[PDB]
Amino acid sequence: RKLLVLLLDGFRSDYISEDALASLPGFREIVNRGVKVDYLTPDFPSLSYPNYYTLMTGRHCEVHQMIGNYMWDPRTNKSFDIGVNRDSLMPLWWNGSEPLWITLMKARRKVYMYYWPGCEVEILGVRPTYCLEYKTVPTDINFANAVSDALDSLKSGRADLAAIYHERIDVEGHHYGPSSPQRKDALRAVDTVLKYMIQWIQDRGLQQDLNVILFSDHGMTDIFWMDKVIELSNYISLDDLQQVKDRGPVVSLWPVPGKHSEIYHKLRTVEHMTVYEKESIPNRFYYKKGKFVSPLTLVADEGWFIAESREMLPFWMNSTGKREGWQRGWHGYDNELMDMRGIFLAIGPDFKSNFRAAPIRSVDVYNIMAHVAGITPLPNNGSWSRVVSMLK
Ligand SMILES: *[C@@H]1O[C@H](CO[C@H]2O[C@@H](C)[C@@H](O)[C@@H](O)[C@@H]2O)[C@@H](O[C@@H]2O[C@H](CO)[C@@H](O)[C@H](O)[C@H]2NC(C)=O)[C@H](O)[C@H]1NC(C)=O
Ligand SMILES: *[C@@H]1O[C@H](CO)[C@@H](O[C@@H]2O[C@H](CO)[C@@H](O)[C@H](O)[C@H]2NC(C)=O)[C@H](O)[C@H]1NC(C)=O
Ligand SMILES: *[C@@H]1O[C@H](CO)[C@@H](O[C@@H]2O[C@H](CO)[C@@H](O)[C@H](O)[C@H]2NC(C)=O)[C@H](O)[C@H]1NC(C)=O
Ligand SMILES: C[N+](C)(C)CCOP(=O)(O)O
Ligand SMILES: [Zn+2]
Ligand SMILES: [Zn+2]
């Protein structure tokens, strides 16, 4: 039957703990009438673009190839800069595996996507039926309207799958911290939309024709500027680097020829991070085989933040003029950290009700989505055994 998928960026698993659900009527109703996993473990790195593609392919990042929010290809000398630069639209970055919406389009199913990062790309020669492109952070009004519009498109048969992306829980987790009232306010707004979404589904006659799946790409943890900042320019010269990508927990480095060993050994001494040669990256990350993975990768300890320098931190615009706001939450760290856990819930004719499911991994979600959408999944890294018991 029809499928509505909701991606809630940055939604940490314990945001809907038992204690939290006592004041979250929308999620409480989904929990009471559907499926909730204890938590969703993301892929490494626990960043957006990697986990977006893990969720929609069922494959680890070393397979689908989207291994960072920021990536560089030495062959073409082109960059993927968290989807902003025009070259992010190159199928080079996206053709490493076929995501579910492309498979559905090629099976002549109709797909509507709202603000979903990636829907604006021609992937493997294909695009979804409809894409409302992500431009800025969507507002809570944008979210409520997309949910209503998606239900209309599913009811009218213009869409078989509708997929909606919402960012603001991530933004407030970053700007104010995961335990902040600002983050809780953004969650409350989503909870209220979901409460009425349930009413809209019933009221428009879709309750028996529609499953709804909700998940997140990763959780969120506290960071501690300026004490817990690692300034790379205190240890190595940028002149010894061909390229550097990203700041924060996971940083990709490409040394100039002849400086690989020196950069490696110099950064090996730095406390509160780990530097890995590509061949020595922990196998459990299912990351090291990706073609875009850099010769050296830095992984910060939880709560620490790697940057070129303090003055080069990603300050945010909390005021009119220059960006001076400190970030208070972040993610990207070791994907087995409790704070990096995300969520998965489901409700509808094909899911059990009031069912607490064991924790699953980001790679497990694709098989579920494909099953209830009625399409054969492409071979992937999900475990059917880890998810099968939530289905009716
Ligand atoms: C915009 O932010 C600056 C920087 O201060 C950061 O301090 C943290 C509390 C963090 O939450 C982050 O949001 C915030 O941006 C604010 O200036 C700072 O104000 C504090 C007291 O609130 C002073 O102790 C600091 O000395 C001062 N630092 C600087 C560089 O000004 C600023 O108030 C804020 N602007 C607005 C309009 O709120
Ligand atoms: C997916 O995108 C890649 C990147 O554009 C395509 O491969 C490139 O294009 C041609 C294919 O032979 C070559 O000249 C390039 O060297 C390729 N670059 C690579 C492979 O990194 C690929 O063909 C696309 N696949 C589909 C099905 O459209
Ligand atoms: C994750 O799944 C992918 C896709 O099924 C696996 O990659 C395939 O592995 C077989 C066996 O070596 C190859 O014949 C295919 O060509 C591979 N496909 C791709 C797209 O790479 C991969 O081995 C799985 N990873 C793990 C850790 O189980
Ligand atoms: C990629 N994005 C800009 C749409 C969302 C935020 O990215 P991320 O901080 O969750 O990795
Ligand atoms: Zn995210
Ligand atoms: Zn984020």
Residue numbers in the entry: 24 to 415
The authors write:
The ecto-nucleotide pyrophosphatases/phosphodiesterases (ENPPs or NPPs) family consists of seven structurally-related ecto-enzymes. ENPP6 hydrolyzes only choline-containing lysophospholipids, such as LPC, sphingosylphosphorylcholine (SPC), platelet-activating factor (PAF) and lysoPAF, but not other lysophospholipids, suggesting that ENPP6 recognizes the choline moiety of its substrates. Here, we showed that GPC is hydrolyzed to phosphocholine by ENPP6, which is present on the extracellular surface of certain cells such as oligodendrocytes and liver sinusoid endothelial cells.
Accordingly, we also determined the crystal structure of ENPP6 in complex with phosphocholine, a reaction product, at 1.8 Å resolution. An electron density corresponding to the bound phosphocholine was observed in the vicinity of the zinc ions in the catalytic pocket. The choline moiety of the phosphocholine is accommodated in a choline-binding pocket formed by the side chains of Tyr72, Tyr75, Tyr157 and Tyr188, while the phosphate group of the phosphocholine is located in the vicinity of the two zinc ions. Furthermore, Asp32 and Glu190 electrostatically interact with the choline moiety. Tyr72 forms a water-mediated hydrogen bond with Glu143, while Tyr75/Tyr188 and Tyr157 form direct hydrogen bonds with Asp32 and Glu190, respectively, thereby stabilizing the conformation of the choline-binding pocket. The conformation of the “insertion loop” is stabilized by a disulfide linkage between Cys142 and Cys154. The Y72A, Y75A, Y188A and E190A mutants exhibited the remarkably reduced α-GPC-hydrolyzing activities, as compared with the wild-type and C393A/C412S mutant proteins, confirming the importance of Tyr72, Tyr75, Tyr188 and Glu190 for choline recognition. The crystal structure of the ENPP6–phosphocholine complex showed that ENPP6 recognizes the choline moiety of phosphocholine, which strongly supports the idea that ENPP6 recognizes the choline moiety of its substrates, such as GPC and LPC, and hydrolyzes them to produce phosphocholine in a similar manner.
